[PDB]
Curated annotation (Swiss-Prot), chain A:
It comes from Saccharomyces cerevisiae (strain ATCC 204508 / S288c) (Baker's yeast). The modification Phosphoserine is found at residue 119. This is Ubiquitin-conjugating enzyme E2 2. Present with 2770 molecules/cell in log phase SD medium. Its EC number is 2.3.2.23. The gene is RAD6. Gene3D superfamilies: Ubiquitin Conjugating Enzyme. E2 ubiquitin-conjugating enzyme that accepts ubiquitin from the ubiquitin-activating enzyme E1 and transfers it to a E3 ubiquitin-protein ligase. In association with the E3 enzyme BRE1 and LGE1, it plays a role in transcription regulation by catalyzing the monoubiquitination of histone H2B to form H2BK123ub1. H2BK123ub1 gives a specific tag for epigenetic transcriptional activation, elongation by RNA polymerase II, telomeric silencing, and is also a prerequisite for H3K4me and H3K79me formation.
Swiss-Prot record, chain C:
It comes from the Eukaryota. This is E3 ubiquitin-protein ligase BRE1. It comes from Saccharomyces cerevisiae (strain ATCC 204508 / S288c) (Baker's yeast). Present with 2980 molecules/cell in log phase SD medium. Belongs to the BRE1 family. Forms a complex with the E2 enzyme RAD6/UBC2. May interact with LGE1. It is found in: Nucleus. E3 ubiquitin-protein ligase that mediates monoubiquitination of histone H2B to form H2BK123ub1 in association with the E2 enzyme RAD6/UBC2. H2BK123ub1 gives a specific tag for epigenetic transcriptional activation, elongation by RNA polymerase II, telomeric silencing, and is also a prerequisite for H3K4me and H3K79me formation. It thereby plays a central role in histone code and gene regulation. Also modulates the formation of double-strand breaks during meiosis. The chain holds residues 21 to 191 of 700 of the full protein.
Amino acid sequence: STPARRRLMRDFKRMKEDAPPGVSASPLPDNVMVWNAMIIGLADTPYEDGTFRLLLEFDEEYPNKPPHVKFLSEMFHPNVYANGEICLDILQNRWTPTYDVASILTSIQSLFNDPNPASPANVEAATLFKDHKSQYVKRVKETVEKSWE
Amino acid sequence: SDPSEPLTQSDVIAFQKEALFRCINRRRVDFEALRKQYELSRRECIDVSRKLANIMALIVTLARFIETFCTDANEKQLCREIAQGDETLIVQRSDSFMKLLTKYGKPSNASDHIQELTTELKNLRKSKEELFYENSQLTEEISALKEYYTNIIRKYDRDE
Amino acid sequence: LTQSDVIAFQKEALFRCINRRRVDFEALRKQYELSRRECIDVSRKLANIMALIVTLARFIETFCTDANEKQLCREIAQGDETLIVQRSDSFMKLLTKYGKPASDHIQELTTELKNLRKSKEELFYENSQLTEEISALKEYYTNIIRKYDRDESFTIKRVFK
């Protein structure tokens, strides 16, 4: 009914005609203000081949306000709080309304291969990312395999 | 699902199964490569221990012979003990035995100094020999693994 | 077993296959470590005895008057297990003969020591390089196979275009 609910509709159209590689996203058939997304981790990244579930919650302040996003699948990333919240720069303090769902999911995917220990949200992850890199890859691989459930 | 079609719920499960196989086949390859390193190291254990049995046999022989010439009782006892063919006593007393061989095997200060030097020569040789055996086994390992992996990769190449 | 067939299996079972393989793998590893510990033990033990023997051979060589005797000692001191076990009777006969109780020779031995020390260091280095090579190799080949499985994954092709 509202313009937020037809903008969301525009993002949904984008997710079909030019669905970006490695992601899916769809709002509940009843509630358009709530979306199931999922991301696949990229090749030559320690998150390769993962299948991470994501929840997006939208209010009537969209696209002026970015939605709340969290992974449902267990995660291990320096920019990932244990509740699934994310520390991405274009979500907090570099957000623009012209970013849609498709550009948000992919702006998150990039974080996998390119983490940001500069704004660390999970201490352990940013740590191993500099000390025991091999061991860090091990924990990320646990994450990936669990994501296939 | 057509590449130009929102990925469906069947599609996702399918992707995960092929990712699972990739992981399974990765741990399987890694496992059988371990199998090869293991079989190799068992073969090598067989072979070093057969050699070991045999040179220890010569050691027992050698120890008996020297015993027949010892002057002092501690010397006699060391030979008889070594002569039992215990595989440890000969490490623990390798120096003292070497010194006995150079003491009696032959027909002032210079003599004692040559004893020290020859003991040292034995120890260095020991080390050289350890390293030589380790390195031989390592090279064999490399060869075993190379032969293993290359065949799988070539089986994929014959898959065009 | 092959990638194309994975579609027919069940997901819940693929996890179990992964755990099957994980536990068996740790088992083989504990075995492998056992094996290696034994090989080093026996190889160090054998090293000691051969060292005692070839040191002896060279020691007694400075006494043997016959050129067959001198050749005997030299060949033994080349350090081969077989040739030692097989010429040990004659070796002992030699030892029976000559056991019945200057400067340049000591210089020879110090020369012997220096060259052997070099050899040891050479081999220690080469040992190290070989361990690294093994590591490198396993990583290299498995990366290659991982790529091969990614190149015949059709799910990958459709997910990524």
